[PDB]
Amino acid sequence: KAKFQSYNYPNMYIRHANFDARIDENVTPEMDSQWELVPGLANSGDGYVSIQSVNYPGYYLRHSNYDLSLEKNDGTSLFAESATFKIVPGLADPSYISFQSYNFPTRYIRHYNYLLRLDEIVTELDRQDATFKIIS
């Protein structure tokens, strides 16, 4: 069980709202920013995880059209592939973390302003937008 705090806006946390994944401050209810890292749905090797909502059990962060949303696992390999991430050292500071996609290993979870998206990471600010602190 963990929250993910943004490296560059450190009072904002990854959270779900109307099934979109985004970051926000003063997250209400606070349980929309609580997550469980579980073994990757598409790969149970060390380092691979899926990111399950604590207040919507069975629903996980999943990418589609390069956007991340909170979606119910429908049991498919397609879902699992797009909802599995490798936790790697933080791209902006390696003592934090970044989430690299399993099926698109050059893309990472990043906030784009308040939206959460799955992007290739080029600039310093892109690295900072893709870096999170695990609060657990």
Q: Which one of the spans 50-58, 92-100, 116-124, 126-134 is the region binding Ca ion (CB under 5 A)?
A: 116-124
Distance between CA atoms of residues 1 and 54, nearest Å: 8
Adjacent-strand bridge partners of 80: none
**Does 116 appear as a known binding residue?**
yes
Which residue type occupies 92?
A
Size of the site for Ca ion (CB under 5 A): 5
The phi, psi pair for 90, rounded to 5°, reads -55, 130
68/121 with CB nearer Ca ion:
68
Distance between CA atoms of residues 74 and 111, nearest Å: 26
Per DSSP bridges, beta strands 48-53 and 85-89 are: antiparallel
Per DSSP bridges, beta strands 35-39 and 48-53 are: antiparallel
**Does 118 appear as a known binding residue?**
no
**Least distance between Ca ion and beta carbon 121 (Å):** 16
- Contact call for residue 68 and Ca ion (CB under 5 A): yes
- Contact call for residue 116 and Ca ion (CB under 5 A): yes
Q: Which one of the spans 18-26, 36-44, 70-78, 86-94 is the region binding Ca ion (CB under 5 A)?
A: 18-26
Distance between CA atoms of residues 115 and 42, nearest Å: 25
* Known binding positions for Ca(2+): 20-21, 67-68, 116
Interacting residues with Ca ion (CB under 5 A)? 20-21, 67-68, 116
* Known binding positions: 20-21, 67-68, 116
